[PDB]
Amino acid sequence: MHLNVGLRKIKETVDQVEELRRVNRSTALLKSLSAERERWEKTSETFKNQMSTIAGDCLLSAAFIAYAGYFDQQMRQNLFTTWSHHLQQANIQFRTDIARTEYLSNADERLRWQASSLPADDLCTENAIMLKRFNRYPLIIDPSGQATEFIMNEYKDRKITRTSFLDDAFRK
């Protein structure tokens, strides 16, 4: 909507220039504004391009968040590849250059995770993304123990508490 308002704003500037012409200074202004509109239309072309490809990226990302939560890196990659191949078969435009670790995460959140002692592995990045965004309460399977440290560091400001099922004070 912002881009389209600006798109008609360019035509308003064109109207102002036309009123001015009704002359070489205004002519130079007109031609450079035409180059400005050239930039506008190339931006809108690629911008409608990601409009066309937004659906497939969201589909793949959602399928990856909901599923693939137990499988290892190899099997997650295999499922993503099969999904992408099927989407290619169905002529559904999904952008490929993006990493699933980058679409669903922001730079500020990634930096906070790094400050929260998150191992820089991309698998751990996917796990962090899934922990951030979920519909069912996650079940963390961490034999290493790094995930617990990451959760405590991330949610320290909210005063996250540690407790175990064996503890009787769990219910309280």
Add this chain to the structure above:
Amino acid sequence: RDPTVEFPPDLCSRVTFVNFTVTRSSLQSQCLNEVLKAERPDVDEKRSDLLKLQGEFQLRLRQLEKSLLQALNEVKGRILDDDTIITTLENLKREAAEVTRKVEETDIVMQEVETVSQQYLPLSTACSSIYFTMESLKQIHFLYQYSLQFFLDIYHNVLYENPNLKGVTDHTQRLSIITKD
């Protein structure tokens, strides 16, 4: 904490899983990133600039775009020649060319940063094999129980606080010394 536990189907339905077990590829990539950030700090900053050409340079491009947009949104001086947005157009073209040349620099990353990754690639595979030898070491004796945090402690004590790296600055010699240590 148990990674091999089996859960009833109801539990698998009510909750989503976030697997954190370390695999050969997982440890490989983790240690690759660890040595990338620890070693070649200038080239680590180069990889940080690889991240910056997406999170800042593209960000600067888009923010200068929107700043130009708002500046020409003012529409001050009706009739009068106030379309001096042209300098911001020149800056926008410079920013776009910078982002495209940064994409070309990422193409060079398919040549140079990938070289930094593959030079440490044998180290990552070797140390992953080391850790899983340590894990498989628990079979021959009940006392040979080593955690991943321990192996990461050795990894840090080798990368950092290493007396053998104080007098060495060349990347290849540092890599040989770091593998030996």
